[PDB]
Design a protein around this ligand. Structure first.
Ligand SMILES: Nc1nc2c(ncn2[C@@H]2O[C@H](COP(=O)(O)OP(=O)(O)O)[C@@H](O)[C@H]2O)c(=O)[nH]1
Ligand SMILES: C[As](C)(=O)[O-]
Ligand SMILES: C[As](C)(=O)[O-]
Ligand SMILES: C[As](C)(=O)[O-]
Ligand SMILES: [Mg+2]
Lengths: 215, 170, 225
């Protein structure tokens, strides 16, 4: 990116947060600045145009300003719905191109802890016919977006065949993750039990499935 | 010298806003154009010898009263008040547009031109004298246009530009 | 409300040329606006590619100028992007956008398309295998039950999943995919339904994998020995 922004910003709810954007005489020093807000999974949305003007649906608490070769975005009434990525943009006379800052991920601190829901699925009979076996462990709706997942074959820990995603922010500012255990049908049929074990903020949820059971 | 004129074309649904605009820009008659499309267009013309830059906003229905929409219209310097001659109600809505135009610009003196479109039709429900009278009460000209035959199209737009000069040069 | 939708191949093999098209609705390509292409590598920031006016005039990002072509096709009301000699650095989400209004400047990006992930890689496309995640007499939660579809071993992203052809919206949660060490992706989609309708109601997940032009409708039925 040609412009410069901090990669992250923090704020407790209700307080005022500032996001800077540093340029040079070619771009910010000579031209208007525009700000864009991007929610996870969606296209960016115009937030501030011409240094400090607001479009529709952009509330009072969003304000911009430009001084010299530098620009700033200010969010006063900080709500949890403001968690998003913010980008500044401007025309650069020397490059004859639109330039962006690297973007700032805004985090609203102090959100309440939430324990994960955990659903564990055994291999489908159909997958077993194909001589494959995948155990699926789905983990959702947890805050502090950090979990550890451990798998157990009976009582012994199993690390081979484990693939776990990194937690990703859902639409309700909570996090989701999943972990997959790949086995051969023989491994599945031999042990009496397998377990997905999820730890979150010192508390643990453990779901278990067995080959013998079958609803 | 390379001067800008920002014109807004307003009127009820189906009066020929998109038809008149596209005839001025792309020089042809569009039969069935999407009624929802609101776009701006740019054309370089020579009015009374002076080379001019024409920016035209072809409005589309759902009128809104957000501040930005007002700001969007304040950018307009002239306004074509367009109605169809076979539409009695589009003529009755003319004053409803004029009141809103003066409201956003905060002024009793706004350059406008009254335009009766679809003047190629054999059937007519709005008399020409009826619109002559309404135009005088506003102090604006009245042009009898037809986008299907391109009769008076340039005349109507060029007149609006001339009504803009006699406002910044006063 | 002008609307933009980008379409193009999900996978491009290197030396090859990436080609994308943006179909424009609710607005003419001949309006006095500038039609841009923007891209965003996954997890990283936005990067402008280039611009075109309906007269054919263009401006390109200098760092990409030698590889980029942007075109306009008024007959189809489209504009397009060609990016030659792709490498792994061109893997990104590529938005099309409209801005630089000329009537009232709101910036270069007033309206945006949705995106379409373009993956530049040397491995080949692979369509998914879809397996049911049957609700068991263990995985119920009282009056509510979770059932799903396992979408295994596909490349490249993305896969989208709906249920009962869109009639089933509430309770749906499609999880982010996992990238396995084999270079293949897998995801699960789950929906919570009343456990009193597992014998009555039919549940079908609609899995769409555009990169391989594959759709799978998988019946998910109660579990049976
Ligand atoms: N005969 C005739 N028909 C017209 C004329 N102008 C517009 N129309 C027709 O009126 C219909 C609506 O016109 P349109 O441009 O879409 O009006 P708008 O909704 O205000 O944009 C179209 O189907 C046109 O064919 C005209 O000058 N003569
Ligand atoms: C109010 As907008 C940024 O959709 O033109
Ligand atoms: C800066 As992101 C690209 O971490 O907002
Ligand atoms: C076409 As431009 C980048 O000068 O708004
Ligand atoms: Mg129209």
């Amino acid at each position: 990116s040609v412009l410069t922004q901090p990669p992250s910003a923090s704020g407790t709810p209700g307080q005022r947060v500032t996001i800077s954007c540093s340029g040079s005489s070619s771009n910010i020093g000579s031209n208007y600045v525009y700000w864009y807000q991007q929610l996870p999974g969606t296209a960016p949305k115009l937030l501030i145009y011409r240094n400090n003007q607001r479009p529709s649906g952009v509330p009072d608490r969003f304000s911009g300003s430009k001084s010299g070769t530098s620009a700033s975005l200010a969010i006063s009434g900080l709500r949890s719905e403001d968690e998003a990525d913010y980008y500044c943009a401007a025309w650069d006379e020397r490059l004859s191109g639109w330039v962006f800052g690297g973007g700032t991920k805004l985090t609203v601190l102090g959100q309440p802890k939430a324990a994960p829901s955990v659903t564990l699925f055994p291999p489908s009979s159909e997958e077993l016919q194909a001589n494959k076996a995948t155990l699926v462990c789905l983990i959702s709706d947890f805050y502090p977006g950090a979990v550890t997942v451990a798998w157990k074959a009976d009582s012994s820990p199993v690390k081979a065949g484990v693939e776990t995603t990194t937690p990703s922010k859902q639409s309700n500012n909570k996090y989701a993750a999943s972990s997959y255990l790949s086995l051969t049908p023989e491994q599945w049929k031999s042990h009496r039990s397998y377990s997905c074990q999820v730890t979150h903020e010192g508390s643990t949820v453990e779901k278990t499935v067995a080959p013998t059971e079958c609803s | 010298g390379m001067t800008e004129y920002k014109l807004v074309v307003v009127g009820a649904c189906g009066v020929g806003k998109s038809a008149l605009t596209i005839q001025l820009i792309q020089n042809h008659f569009v039969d069935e154009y999407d009624p929802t499309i609101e776009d701006s267009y740019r054309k370089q013309v020579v009015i009374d010898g002076e080379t001019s830059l024409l920016d035209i906003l072809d409005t589309a229905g759902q009128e809104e009263y957000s501040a930005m929409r007002d700001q969007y219209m304040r950018t307009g310097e002239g306004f074509l008040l367009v109605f169809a001659i076979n539409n009695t109600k589009s003529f009755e809505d003319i004053h409803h547009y004029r009141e809103q135009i003066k409201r956003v610009k905060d002024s009793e003196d706004v350059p406008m031109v009254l335009v009766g479109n679809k003047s190629d039709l054999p059937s007519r429900t709005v008399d020409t004298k009826q619109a002559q009278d309404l135009a005088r009460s506003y102090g604006i000209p009245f042009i009898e246009t037809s986008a299907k035959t391109r009769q008076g199209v340039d005349d109507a737009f060029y007149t609006l530009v001339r009504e803009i000069r006699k406002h910044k040069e006063k | 409300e002008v609307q933009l939708q980008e379409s193009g191949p999900g996978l491009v093999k290197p030396p090859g040329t990436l080609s994308l098209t943006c179909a424009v609705s609710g607005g003419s390509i001949s309006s006095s606006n500038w039609w841009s292409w923007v891209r965003q590598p996954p997890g990283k920031g936005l990067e402008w590619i280039g611009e075109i006016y309906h007269s054919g005039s263009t401006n390109y990002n200098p760092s990409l100028k030698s590889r980029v072509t942007i075109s306009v096709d008024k007959s189809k009301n489209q504009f397009s992007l060609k990016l030659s000699s792709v490498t792994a650095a061109d893997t990104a989400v590529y938005y099309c956008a409209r801005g630089s209004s000329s009537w009232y400047d709101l910036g270069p990006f007033d309206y945006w398309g949705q995106g379409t992930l373009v993956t530049v890689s040397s491995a080949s496309t692979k369509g998914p295998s879809v397996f049911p995640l049957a609700p068991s007499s263990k995985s119920t939660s009282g009056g509510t039950a979770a059932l799903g579809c396992l979408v295994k071993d596909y490349f490249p992203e993305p896969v989208t999943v709906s249920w009962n052809s869109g009639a089933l919206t509430s309770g749906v949660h499609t999880f982010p995919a996992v990238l396995q060490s084999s270079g293949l992706y897998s995801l699960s989609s789950v929906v919570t339904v009343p456990s009193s309708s597992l014998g009555t109601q039919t549940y079908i997940c609609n899995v769409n994998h555009k990169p391989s032009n594959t759709k799978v409708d998988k019946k998910v039925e109660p579990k049976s020995c």
